[PDB]
Write a protein that binds this DNA or RNA. Structure first.
Ligand SMILES: [K+]
Ligand SMILES: [Mg+2]
Ligand SMILES: [Mg+2]
Ligand SMILES: [Mg+2]
Ligand SMILES: [Mg+2]
Ligand SMILES: [Mg+2]
Ligand SMILES: [Mg+2]
Ligand SMILES: [Mg+2]
Ligand SMILES: [Mg+2]
Ligand SMILES: [Mg+2]
Ligand SMILES: [Mg+2]
Ligand SMILES: [Mg+2]
Ligand SMILES: [Mg+2]
Ligand SMILES: [Mg+2]
Ligand SMILES: [Mg+2]
Ligand SMILES: [Mg+2]
Ligand SMILES: [Mg+2]
Ligand SMILES: [Mg+2]
Ligand SMILES: [Mg+2]
Ligand SMILES: [Mg+2]
Ligand SMILES: [Mg+2]
Ligand SMILES: [Mg+2]
Ligand SMILES: [Mg+2]
Ligand SMILES: [Mg+2]
Ligand SMILES: [Mg+2]
Ligand SMILES: [Mg+2]
Ligand SMILES: [Mg+2]
Ligand SMILES: [Mg+2]
Ligand SMILES: [Mg+2]
Ligand SMILES: [Mg+2]
Ligand SMILES: [Mg+2]
Ligand SMILES: [Mg+2]
Ligand SMILES: [Mg+2]
Ligand SMILES: [Mg+2]
Ligand SMILES: [Mg+2]
Ligand SMILES: [Mg+2]
Ligand SMILES: [Mg+2]
Ligand SMILES: [Mg+2]
Ligand SMILES: [Mg+2]
Ligand SMILES: [Mg+2]
Ligand SMILES: [Mg+2]
Ligand SMILES: [Mg+2]
Ligand SMILES: [Mg+2]
Ligand SMILES: [Mg+2]
Ligand SMILES: [Mg+2]
Ligand SMILES: [Mg+2]
Ligand SMILES: [Mg+2]
Ligand SMILES: [Mg+2]
Ligand SMILES: [Mg+2]
Ligand SMILES: [Mg+2]
Ligand SMILES: [Mg+2]
Ligand SMILES: [Mg+2]
Ligand SMILES: [Mg+2]
Ligand SMILES: [Mg+2]
Ligand SMILES: [Mg+2]
Ligand SMILES: [Mg+2]
Ligand SMILES: [Zn+2]
Lengths: 118, 56, 231, 119, 122
RNA sequence: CAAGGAACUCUGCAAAUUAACCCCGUAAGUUAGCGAGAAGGGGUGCUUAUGUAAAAGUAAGCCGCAGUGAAGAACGAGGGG
RNA sequence: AGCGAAAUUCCUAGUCGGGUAAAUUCCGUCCCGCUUGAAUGGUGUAACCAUCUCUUGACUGUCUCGGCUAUAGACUCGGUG
RNA sequence: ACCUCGAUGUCGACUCAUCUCAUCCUCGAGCUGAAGCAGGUUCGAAGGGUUCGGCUGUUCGCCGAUUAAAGAGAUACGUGAGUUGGGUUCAAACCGUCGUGAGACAGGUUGGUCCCUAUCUAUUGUGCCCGUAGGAAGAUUGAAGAGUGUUGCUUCUAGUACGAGAGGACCGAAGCGAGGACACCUCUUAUGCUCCAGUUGUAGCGCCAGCUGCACCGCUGGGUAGUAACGUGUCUAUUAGAUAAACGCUGAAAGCAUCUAAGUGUGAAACUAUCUCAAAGAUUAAUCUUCCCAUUUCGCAAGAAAGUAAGAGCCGUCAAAGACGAUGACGUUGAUAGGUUACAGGUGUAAGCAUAGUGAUAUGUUGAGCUGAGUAAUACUAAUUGCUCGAGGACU
């Protein structure tokens, strides 16, 4: 009657995981298509921006996307394995950390991440 | 704060009623026979069948 | 009323995404098949209840009086014994699982022993206010609050019974009501309950029919992912 | 109350563990308090299992723990560990050290403990 | 979470550069104001060619917050500055344009004019 | 210590910001001495080369979220008794 | 003469203007100054003050509103007391 | 001027509140100079709630913006062996005024020491002993109790009822909130002193490289488990009974009338329950189930010498627990703790080598290396082969 709690939690999480779950590092630019539902239909709204963090293990995997519109910077936390949300990695960039917090302090020409990564 | 009335010689003993001591559990060593307090190495450094320390 | 009850062990907390676009935190309860160890009737006892046995264990881990009772009643040896009031309609010696008791999305309440916290102060225990920190202060900063009711022979001159002061907090039974069951897992004998359940992971948990909403069952369905592996 | 003693700081605890583990590797027995032996045992076992491969990386890892003793230096303690002590525990699944309880001290009544290398 | 006596920016064309919160309108001891909440404010930094004058007490609705709030699906919307726009009794904006992005919580609490006059809703 | 930033209190009490060196710039008033380190800003790491008695500096390159990378260094403006 | 609701004004939280969403405090002015006033000096005054008083920028756990961590105590054991 | 001058600390503020009703809001009703909406007055009702600021030491007070409301009092004008000392009222100094003067002013202003380790009782928690009449291990009923009880906005009903119009419902239903409460850490945050990485100075490991000590944990960016809210789940319903004010039906005394005298109703957030928690020391000590006692002799029987079991305790490993006790798991017939193995999460490509560059440094091996508590297996180590207590239930 030994109970591996982590395994049971993993099974509940597997019930609703996704197949692809594309990868991205901290400093990456992705395109997030929100399937916003009105009374009818869906309006696919894109939230293209730069990733800042990807934390979590399973159904609770979340990532941070930062965008700038009209000079106003907005940061948005998405859940990876959340329906009506589609992620498409666009550019892979090089960073030396996992949580690039300085992006919410540095802006303009100093907020540009060089490409390539390993 | 200090006692406005002196405590008699009876309340003192009633409080001390819980100050009694307990006899620690003892056992017999299996190689020399002297009493040692339980779950501890004896005076010969012989715990069970293992020579722990040199004899006293 | 017609109260249904089951016993289980809380294993952790997760989340599930559901249709109508909500993210629902859930608690996972491992529910072993419970065995009805006794039925007590209204006429013969002056009240009605059902006592089940759960959390089965080997016979060498049980005391002599309890194993004698189990072998006299022809039951599986279990170390946990408890009853629920007003639970009727179950024959003695029948295995009961939550699938036969509750529906897919009906309302239930959950009772569990709260997480022990030890000797806590007045502020952490009774949501009291902390005294000022600057502009000059005194030795008691985390003060409980003046317990004066009346000074003088014409007034109380005593701390009133049931005052709010520091003491033991935690390790106490608490019930959270109107929690909707989300899903059943027959193979893993695993119940999904919305919201947060009190108690540490691995503690005992009692799932009962909600007295506030006894027959109310609010529909809930999960979301099927539409994703496709890379093109 | 002020001008208090520095206290059992985290740095003091790490240094205490370092000294006892260096001594227990040098001599082979330590007569300390029980609660200090029960904490030095973890570091002793960790050092012994990491010193089973004998590569220069493992020497650099151990040198962050070993200290100079009377019977060996910090460089000869390395040779003793990697050539005499650790090779003995080559297929033992952990538990290279044993802690046993002696009597109470005359001036403290604290429970003493002997920490030894289990052959 | 904008609170009492909080200086925030105005994202409209009305001549008001800095606005101070006075009351979190809606109930007794309403501690905070989240996205979509209505507040009473006072213009503190204004411009000569502006419809409002310095010192007027007016009513505004918040559109952005630095702290941010979490939606039902789990998305956490977070801006980098607290912004509000000046509204009239009818819930109609006082300005003719809205600068920058605004949240969608406005859509729930009416405020259809604010959404239609915004640059892009989030 | 997230958001707010004196809403606390008799009072910004206390705490917090600035802080070293070098390079710009510095008002009203005045007994013409001051005000004044006014206010307000910028640079500081490592390598190569040029500079010198040594420098300081200058040019190019490299790394980090941050370069008197830790310690020690002035918070300011206005009116009145 | 000068100054004047003043470290002086009882009535008085005097009238008016400024500062604030709102100002018994503050600044200017008005003058029935009960009881200001010229070496127990009167009126101004640049610089200075661990002086008093008011507004303000940055700044912060003073506060909305409390929370976490580490030591020394407190708490347990042995000794003195 | 009765208690207190061999001392009863006196204003305001902070914290904690409790009680009364002469009720501010919510709840019910009568009258109205009550068309509707919004009012006025009276009656019943104390369950809950009753805001934040500017000026002043202020209570008070005026003003600003909200709210359903910003109630009146008492409790040594509650509360300094709980905090503060702004005010009053010590010594210092000045102004106005009085005095010839030293000095004085419920006139003004600047500054100015607030002690105590809790004995009894009261209270919040947690234990030992004994009783409950054989002992022990479990599961219960519930006498007497404690906790919560607040309310707003929008839509529909319905622009319907009413009203020339303007305006605008009672009743009922749904959705969304503010405050308060309980629990939890999936998400967002705060912390996370034997975690990861970057990095400065200095002293060491004989030197380079690489590490260690110290400098607030040296500083900085993240961060496991845990602890929490600023976070998210739930509650703040509903129903029944007996009623207050009020309205009754049928009905006489008093051929009419009349709610009342008989009989029979309706009726509020108040009361008794329904909801949550604890509870047989409830000595009036309750009920049920299971297990273990049922010796040989002597005499004296709720007698002796030995002699018989369930269980409990001492000791050890511990943490779902915890100041210490206790609670809970285990003690070799074992996964309780440590170690080992594998993994998760976290950090972010380790040391070394090779290439490139004159060098700082970059690239490849390399999503590499490291890791406190996390997940699960594995007796390798520590929980020894030990000691003590403990039963025949009087009779009616
Ligand atoms: K007296
Ligand atoms: Mg005696
Ligand atoms: Mg004692
Ligand atoms: Mg003091
Ligand atoms: Mg203090
Ligand atoms: Mg009396
Ligand atoms: Mg009395
Ligand atoms: Mg240190
Ligand atoms: Mg903060
Ligand atoms: Mg800020
Ligand atoms: Mg103030
Ligand atoms: Mg105040
Ligand atoms: Mg200061
Ligand atoms: Mg100046
Ligand atoms: Mg003047
Ligand atoms: Mg004159
Ligand atoms: Mg004049
Ligand atoms: Mg003045
Ligand atoms: Mg004025
Ligand atoms: Mg003053
Ligand atoms: Mg003036
Ligand atoms: Mg004079
Ligand atoms: Mg004279
Ligand atoms: Mg003058
Ligand atoms: Mg001075
Ligand atoms: Mg100590
Ligand atoms: Mg002692
Ligand atoms: Mg007399
Ligand atoms: Mg008296
Ligand atoms: Mg006396
Ligand atoms: Mg006294
Ligand atoms: Mg006193
Ligand atoms: Mg009344
Ligand atoms: Mg009630
Ligand atoms: Mg002010
Ligand atoms: Mg009185
Ligand atoms: Mg008083
Ligand atoms: Mg009072
Ligand atoms: Mg009086
Ligand atoms: Mg007192
Ligand atoms: Mg006091
Ligand atoms: Mg004191
Ligand atoms: Mg007293
Ligand atoms: Mg004073
Ligand atoms: Mg003072
Ligand atoms: Mg004097
Ligand atoms: Mg005179
Ligand atoms: Mg009682
Ligand atoms: Mg988590
Ligand atoms: Mg070196
Ligand atoms: Mg009723
Ligand atoms: Mg009649
Ligand atoms: Mg009734
Ligand atoms: Mg008796
Ligand atoms: Mg373990
Ligand atoms: Mg490498
Ligand atoms: Zn021996």
């Amino acid at each position: 009657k030994k109970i591996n709690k982590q395994a049971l939690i993993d099974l509940v999480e597997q019930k609703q995981l996704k197949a692809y779950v594309p990868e991205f590092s901290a400093g990456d630019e992705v395109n997030v298509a929100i399937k916003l539902k009105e009374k009818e239909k869906v309006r696919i709204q894109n939230f293209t921006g730069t990733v800042l963090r990807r934390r979590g293990k399973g159904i609770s995997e979340t990532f941070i996307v930062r965008k700038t519109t009209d000079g106003i910077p907005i940061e948005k936390n998405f859940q990876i394995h959340n329906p009506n949300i589609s992620i498409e990695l666009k550019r892979r960039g090089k960073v030396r950390r996992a949580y690039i917090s300085y992006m919410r302090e540095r802006s303009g020409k100093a907020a540009k991440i060089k490409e390539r990564k390993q | 704060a200090v006692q406005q009335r002196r405590s008699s010689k009876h309340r003192r003993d009633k409080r001390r009623s819980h100050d009694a001591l307990t006899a620690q559990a003892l056992s017999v060593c299996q190689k020399c026979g002297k009493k040692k307090l339980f779950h501890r190495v004896c005076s010969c450094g012989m715990y069970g069948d293992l020579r722990v320390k040199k004899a006293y | 009323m017609e109260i249904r009850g089951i016993f289980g062990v809380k294993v952790g907390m997760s989340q599930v995404f559901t249709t109508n676009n909500e993210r629902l935190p859930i608690t996972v309860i491992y529910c072993e098949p419970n065995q009805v160890a006794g039925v007590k009737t209204e006429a013969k006892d002056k009240y009605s209840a059902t006592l089940l046995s759960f959390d089965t264990v080997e016979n060498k881990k049980l005391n002599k009086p309890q194993q004698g009772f189990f072998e006299k009643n022809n039951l599986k040896p279990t170390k946990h014994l408890q009853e629920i009031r007003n639970m009727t309609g179950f024959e003695m010696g029948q295995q009961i699982t939550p699938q036969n008791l509750f529906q897919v999305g009906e309302y239930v309440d959950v009772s569990a022993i709260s997480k022990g916290r030890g000797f806590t102060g007045a502020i952490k225990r009774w949501n009291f206010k902390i005294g000022p920190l600057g502009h000059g202060a005194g030795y008691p900063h985390r003060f409980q609050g003046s317990v004066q009711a009346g000074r003088g022979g014409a007034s109380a001159q005593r701390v009133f019974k049931g005052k709010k002061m520091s003491g033991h907090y935690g390790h106490e039974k608490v019930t959270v009501q109107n929690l909707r069951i989300v899903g059943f897992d027959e193979a893993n004998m695993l119940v999904l309950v919305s919201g947060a359940i009190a108690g540490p992971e691995g503690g005992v948990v009692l799932i009962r029919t909600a007295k506030k909403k006894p027959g109310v069952v609010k529909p809930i369905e999960l979301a099927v992912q539409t994703e496709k592996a890379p093109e | 109350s002020y001008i208090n003693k520095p206290g059992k700081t985290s740095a003091w605890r790490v240094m205490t563990v370092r000294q006892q583990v260096s001594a227990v590797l040098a001599y082979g027995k330590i007569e300390t308090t029980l609660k200090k032996a029960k904490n030095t045992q973890k570091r002793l076992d960790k050092l012994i299992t990491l010193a089973k491969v004998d590569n220069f990386n493992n020497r650099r890892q151990v040198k962050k723990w070993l200290l100079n003793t009377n019977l060996f230096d910090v460089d000869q303690l390395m040779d003793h560990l990697f050539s005499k002590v650790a090779p003995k525990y080559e297929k033992t699944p952990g538990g290279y050290s044993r802690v046993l309880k002696l009597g109470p001290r005359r001036g403290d009544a604290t429970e003493m403990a002997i920490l030894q290398l289990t052959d | 979470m904008v609170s009492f006596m909080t200086r925030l920016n105005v994202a409209d064309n009305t001549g008001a550069k800095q606005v101070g919160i006075i009351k979190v309108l809606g109930s007794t001891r309403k501690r905070y104001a989240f996205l979509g909440d209505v507040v009473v404010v006072s213009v503190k930094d204004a411009i000569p060619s502006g419809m409002v004058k310095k010192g007027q007490v007016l009513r505004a609705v918040i559109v952005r917050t630095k702290k941010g709030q979490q939606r039902k699906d789990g998305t956490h919307l977070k801006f980098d500055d607290n912004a509000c726009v000046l509204i009239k009794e009818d819930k109609s904006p006082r300005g003719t344009r809205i600068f920058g992005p605004v949240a969608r919580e406005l859509r729930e609490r009416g405020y259809n004019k604010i959404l239609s006059l915004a640059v892009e809703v989030v």
